[PDB]
Write a structure and sequence with these properties.
Chain lengths: 181, 176, 175, 174, 174, 175, 172, 170, 178, 181, 178
C-alpha cells in the first residue's frame, strides 16, 4: 500500500515509507476514528518528537470523526504536557473529539482548509454520573481554548450541526482559514 | 505481489511511479485513500514547487469529505497537477478530474465520466455538502449553477467528448 | 408466549384489545408495522365511523414514509383518535402522538417525548421530506415553522409537562 | 403477530380481502406477485363487475414480477381502484398508474417515483425498459420522449405533480 | 414446549392469567412491556376491585420499558401484589417496590438489587437516572441521599435487608 | 415432534394430569418459569395429593434453581422426587429437597453435589453459602462435611448418595 | 413432513396407539425424556400388554441411554426390541435390554457393541464399567469377553449378534 | 405451503390412496417416516398393493437398507415408480419392488453406481450386501453387478429394463 | 501502521525507539501476552542498568488479574525505580500497576480517570482469594486500612487525579513539566 | 508488536527481538496454553541450549493454564533428557500441565514469585481406558518429583483448588518463594 | 514467534528450525498433509545431496493424517540411501507410527512417556479404501516382522501402547530411559 520515498546524498541514500518521512518532518497524522490504539501511536510519536527536541514545533493533521473520549483526552493532555509548539490542521472534517484536538493547538497555529467541516456536537458501559463528569471536562476544555463561556459551549454542543471554517474561526476553534491556493 | 523493478535500486512500481511524480487514485475513495493521496501530494511539492504532478484517476468516487480533502490539497499545492482519466471517473472521481489545472485535464477515449452522485447526517448538512459540490464544479467547468444542478440530477455517464464540451476535460487523446 | 384470554369467545391479548378499539403502536415503525396499523385503522372505521379509536404509542421512531402513511390514515378516517404516550414517543412516534384528535392526546407521567430526528435517496429528497415534518408539526402544535425548525435541531428529550406546553400533548395525568 | 377480527373470524388481511381489498406492501418479487395474482383471480370469480381496491406502499421490485401483476390487472374485467399510501416508487408507480381511469387515488403525503433506481444480456434489459415506456405512455398519455426524459431524473413527484403528469386522478387532501 | 392444562383448556400462562397472575420473567424490553401492559389493562376491565398478582424473576432491562410498566401499575385502580421469586435486579427491583403497600412479598432465597449495573445524550441518561431516585424515594420512604448512595454499591440485598430498606413488606418462610 | 396422545393431549400434558412435573436438561430462568407455574397449578387442584418431579439435569443457573426450590418448599403438597439418568449441581439440590421418605433413584443414576466450574466475588460467595445451608438442612450433614464434599469433582452412586442423605430409596423395580 | 392418518393422528401418534415406540437417530436428553414419557404412559394404559421398541440409532449420550435402560427395566411390561438398520453404541444396549426371547433383528441390520470415540478420567471409567455389567447381565458373556469385544472397532451381523446373545431372533 | 384438498394435505391424501412418496435424499429421518407409513399401510390391509413413488439421488446406505428390509418384511405387494431419477440407494428401492410391478416414466434416469467415520472393512461389507441385493432382484451375476457399479454413468429406462432394474416403461 | 525511525544508524519502530529511552507502554487491556511482553522488557531494562529509572505509561481498562499480578511482581522484583504515568485512564488492574510505582514517582495528567473498583471460570473460593490479595496490595501501597480499601473498592465510580492523590494512589498531578 | 532490541557487540550492533535476546541468556518462556506447536518450539530451544553448553543452567519461565497432556509430556521428557540444570520460575500462574513443568525442574532450582497461583488439579477424544492410562502417568511423575505418595497425589489432584507458593513449597512443588523486598 | 539464533559461520543467524535442519534434523510435528509431505520430502532430498552417508534424524510428534501424503514421505525415506534415525517425541499415532517404524533397523527410538498407536482412527470408492489399507498391512509387516494376521488384528484394537510394548511389537529398537 504505502509507497517508499528516498533521500540521497550521493555517497548513499535512505528510504522511508511516506508516513515515517512525514514523521521525520515532525508531522503527526490523526486520520479516521480515534481509539486506544490510535492514541497509543499518537502519544508515542509526541513523546518521541519531544525527545528529539523540546523546542521545534510539531504539526498535527486532523481528519477524523472523533472517537473514544478517554482516548482523545489522553492525546489532548499529552499535547498540553509536551513543551513543543503544536500546529494543528483540519482537512476534510474534524468532528466531536477531533475538533477538541483541533481547538487544543497553540494559539495562532490552528488552521483549516476551505472545505473542512467542523462539529462541536458530540454525536449520540459507564455509570450515568460518570458520563456527565466526562462532558463537564469537555465543556471546560472547549471554554478554555475557545474563550467562550460555559453557557455558550453547553448550548452550542446541543445543536447537531457542522460549522463552516469561518464559523469555527469566529467561534474560536480556528485562528486561520487558508484560502490562498 | 507487486512486481519489483530494476549503482541500482529496486522499487515496487507504485514507488517507481511516485519517483516519476505519478499519483494513482484507483478504486473507491475513503479516509485511508485520502490520507495516502494527501501525503503523496505534499511530499511531491517538497521535491519541487515547479514540476507538474500527474494524477491517474480510475475511481467510482467515494466519501465526499475524503474527496474534498484531496481537492483542497490539490488546490493548496503550488505545482501544476495533470489529471488523467483512465477507465472511469464517477461522482467524487470526476471532481478530482475537473480540479486539475486548466489545459492539463486529459482522458483516454473509452473512459466514462459521471458527475451525478448515485444513491448518519442531518438533512440540513447533506444539502450543505451538495451546494459545495455545485460551487466547485461551477468554478472549474465555467458553468452556471442551474446547469450543474440539472446535469447532476440525470443518472447517466457521458463520453470524454461530452465531458470536454461540458468542461470536465481539455484534451481527449485518441492518438497514441 | 402471547397470552390467550376468554370473554363466550377466546382471543390473543392483542386481538382482545382490538375489540376495545385499541391499536398498539409499539416498537420501531416500518412498512411491516405501518401496513398492519393501517389495516386495523380502516377495519375499526367499518366497525363504526363514530366511536373513538385508542392508539397506544411506545416507539423510538422509524421510517418516515411509514409514519407518514400511518399519519395520513389517521387523518383520513372520520373517527376521533385518542393517543396515549406510554414510556417513549420519539421521532416519528412523537408525530403520531401529536396527530391525535385535539383534546385527546395524553401522557403518563414518566413518558419521554422527542421531536428531534436522530441520525439511500438524493439530498433534495431528504430535505423535501424534512419540510413535510415541519408543516405537520406546525399544523398540530400551532408553533411557528421557525420554532419547529429550531426545536427539532436540539438532540434532547422532553418531559410530558413540557410537551404539553409545546402543544404536543393535551393532558398529563397520573390516574 | 397479526390481529384476528370477527360469527366467523379472520386475520386482518383476510378480513380486508372480504372487502375486495388487496394490499401491495413492501418490495415486489415472484412470491408477492404469486399472492397478488391469486387474490386478483379469486376476486374476479366472486364478481366480475364489482370493483377491487389495491393499496400500494412499495419501493418497487422485480420488473417481470410487476409485469405479471400488471398483466393480471388488465386481464380481469373488474375495475381496480389503486390507492397510493406512503410511497409508490419504480414498479410500484406503474401498478398505481395502471388502475382504472378515474380510480387512481393518493393520500396527500405520498411520494411517487417513476425513475428506476440503479443477470441478463444488455440487449434484454433495454427490451424490458422499452416495455415500461410503452406501458407508462398508454396510461399516462404522455409521449414516449416525455416519459423517457422524465424517467431519467432521480427524483420523486408530489401527488399534485403526479396528478399533473397523469399518474393520478385524485388527491384526497383532507 | 408449554403444557396445556384442563370445560376448556389453556396453556399454563393463560390458566394462570385467569387467576389474575402476571409473570414478569427474564429481561424487560419493549415487547415484554407491551405484553405486561396489555395484561394489566385487560385485568382491570374484568374488575377494578380484585387484586392483581405480579410474579417477578428478572435481571431488569430497558429503563423506559420498565417505566412504561411502572406507570401502568400506578394508573390502574386495582391493588397489585408483587412477588419476588429468585431474583429482582435493577428495573425488576423497582417493579417489586412499586407494588401496593402491604402487598410486596419475597421468598426466603430471593436476591434483591437496586443498583443499576452497566445511545442518548449524557444529559438524558442523568435525567432518566434522577427519575429512578424519585420513584425509589417515594416507595421505600428513604431519602434521596440514601437512595443515591445505596444505588452506587454493586451489591445484592437479602430479603430481610430489603424489608428493612422498605422494598418489601413481608418475607414468607415458605 | 412430540407425540399427541389420547381428550387428546400432548404427552407432557398427559403426564401433568397425573401430577408429574419433568425437570429435564439444563435449568434456567425459562425452565424455572415453567416449573413454578406447574407447581402452583398442581397445588390449586389439590393441596393434599403428592406431586412427582422427574429430574435428569446437569445443573443450571443457581438463582433459577433457588426459585424452583423455594416453590417446592412453599406449596403444601408432598413432592416425590425421582432421579433418572443424572442429578448434578442444582439438580441434586432439587432432588435432595423432596419430602423425606419420598426421594428416589434408579440404579444407574449419577449424583453430583459438586458445582462444576456478571457477579461480584462477594456475591458469588454469598450464593455458595446458601447452598451449604440448604444441603445441610436436607441431608443432615454438618456444614464442614457439605463444604468439603462440594470440593471434590466427583459423582456419587445412588447407594452412596443415599448414605449421604441425598436419597431415601434406590428402586430396581416397583416396591 | 409427517403425514396425518385417520379420529386422526400423526403417523407417530398412530404408532404410539399400537404401543410402538420409535427410538430413531442419535440419543440425547431430549430423546430420552420423550422415550421415558411414552414408556410410563404405555405402562399406565396396561401393565400386561407388551411394548414394541424400534431402534435405528448410532447411540449417543451414555447418561441418556442409561436413563432409558433403567426405565425399560423398571416398568412391568414386556418390551419387544427391533433392530432396524443399525444399533450401535448405546443403541445396541437398548437392543440387548429387551425381554428375553423378544429381541429381534432384520437381515441387513448392523450391530456394534464398541463405543466409538467435561468429566474426570475416573468418572468415564466408572460409566464404562457400568456398561460391562449391563452387557454381561443381558448377553450372559463374561466381563472379560465383553471388555475384549468392546475394544474391537467393528460392526457385526445379526447372526453373530445372535450368537453373542445380543439377539434372540433374526427374521428373514 | 402444502395444498389442502374430510380435508388433508396433499401427501396425507395420497397416503390415503396407499401411496408412499420417497422423494429427495434418503436419511435416517426419511427412513423413519417411510417405515412408519409402510407398517401402517400393512395394518389397514395385508392384501392391497402399496404404490411407492421414487425421485432421489441416493442417501445413507443403512437408511436405505432399513427401508429395503421393511419392504421385504411386509406382506403387501409394492408397486414402484421411478419418476425423474433413481440413483445410488434409490435404484435399490426401485429394483426391490414386486416382480412385474417395477415401472418407469420415459425420461427417468437410473443409476446403480454409488457416487463419490467407519473402518475400511465395514465399508466393504456394506457394499458386498448391495451386490447380493442387486443380484437377487436383477438376476444378474455378482461379476456383472460388480462391473456395472464401477461405471460412473446413468442408464435409460430401457437399459434398466433389460438389466432387470425395471419391468415396464410407460 | 507503525512509524519507523532511523537513529552508523539503525531503524526502529516507534515502540522500540522509545524502549531505548527506557519507556514501557502498558496501553490497552492486559492479558497473558501483554504480561509476557512487559515482563521481558522490564527484565531487559534492568539488565541494561539496575539503577536508572524506568518509565511506565499506562492507559488501560484493566485485564486478567493473574496477568496483572505477574506484572506487579516483576515491578517489585527489579531494583530500578519505576516512574508510573497515567494517561487517559487507569482502571482495575491498571490502577494497581499505577499504585505499585515507586513512592514519589506516581504521576497523573489532569484529565486521567482512576478507578479502584473491579467491574465484572474458577470456584467461588478462588475468586475471593484473588480479591483478598488485591486488598492487601492496595493497602500496602496506598496505606489505607483493609476495611477502607474494601469499602472504596465496592463503589462503581472513578476518582479524579486529585482524589486519587488524596487516596494515596498518586503522588503528583502535573499540568506541565516542572 | 514485539519490540526489537540491540546487543552491543565489539564495535558492532546485533539486533534481536526481545525473545531471542532472552533466549541468548538461556531463558525459555512457556507462556499461555501448551500445544504441539508450543512443545515443538520449546523442545528445539532446549536441544539448542544444550548444544551451546551442557553445563550452564537453563531458565524456564512458566505462566500457563496447561494444555495438551502429550505435548507437556514431550516437554517433560526433553527437560529430563538434557544434561543441563533447569531453573524453573512460576510467574503469575502454573496450572495443570504447567505445574508439572514447574515441579519437574532441578531440585533446589524451582522458584515462585509471591502472588503466583499453583494448581495440581486437571480441570474437566480417546477411549476411556486411554485417559486413565495417561492420568496414571501424571500420578507417577508428581509422586517422583514431589516425593508425596501416590495416595496423597491422587487425593490432592481431586480437589478443584489453587494453592499459594508457600503451600506448594510445603507440598514439594517448588523450593523457594522470592518474598518481595 | 519463532526464535532466531546465532552460530559460528558467529556472524550467521537462523530461525530455530533452520538451525536444526543444518544438524540434519527433520521435524514431523502435528498432522500430516500434502503441504507437510511436500516440505518434508524437499528436506530429505536436500539432506541426501549434502551427503548420502551421514544419518538423518526425524523427530515425530504426530496424530498422523492423509495416507497418501504419509506414503509419499515413506517412499522418500526408503528411496534415499542415508540411515534415518526416527525419534518418537510425545506421540506417534496412525500414519505417524508408520514413519516411526520405517526408520533404519536399530535407529528407532522413543522417549519414556511417548504413546504409540498403529490403529487407524475413524471421497473414494470402497475398493480403493481397502486397497490402501492392505498397503499399510504390508508396510507394517515388512518393518515390524510380524505376520499379516497379527498386523490385521493389532490394527483393529483402538488402543495406544507404551514404548516398551511397541518395542516388543517391533516398532521400536530403543527406549531412552533418559
Amino acid at each position: 500500500l504505502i509507497p517508499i520515498v528516498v533521500e540521497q546524498t550521493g555517497r548513499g541514500e535512505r528510504a522511508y515509507d511516506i508516513y515515517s518521512r512525514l514523521l521525520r518532518e515532525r508531522i503527526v497524522c490523526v486520520m479516521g476514528p480515534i481509539d486506544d490504539s490510535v492514541a497509543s501511536l499518537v502519544i508515542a510519536q509526541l513523546l518521541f518528537l519531544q525527545s528529539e527536541s523540546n523546542k521545534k514545533p510539531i504539526h498535527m493533521y486532523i481528519n477524523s470523526p472523533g472517537g473514544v473520549v478517554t482516548a482523545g483526552l489522553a492525546i489532548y493532555d499529552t499535547m498540553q504536557y509536551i513543551l513543543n509548539p503544536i500546529c494543528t490542521w483540519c482537512v476534510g472534517q474534524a468532528a466531536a473529539m477531533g475538533s477538541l484536538l483541533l481547538a487544543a493547538g497553540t494559539p495562532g497555529m490552528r488552521h483549516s482548509l476551505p472545505n473542512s467541516r467542523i462539529m462541536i456536537h458530540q454525536p449520540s458501559a459507564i455509570q450515568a454520573e460518570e458520563i456527565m463528569k466526562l462532558k463537564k471536562q469537555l465543556y471546560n476544555i472547549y471554554a478554555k481554548h475557545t474563550k467562550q463561556s460555559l453557557q455558550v459551549i453547553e448550548s452550542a454542543m446541543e445543536r447537531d450541526r457542522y460549522m463552516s471554517p469561518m464559523e469555527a474561526q469566529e467561534f474560536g476553534i480556528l485562528d486561520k482559514v487558508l484560502v490562498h491556493p
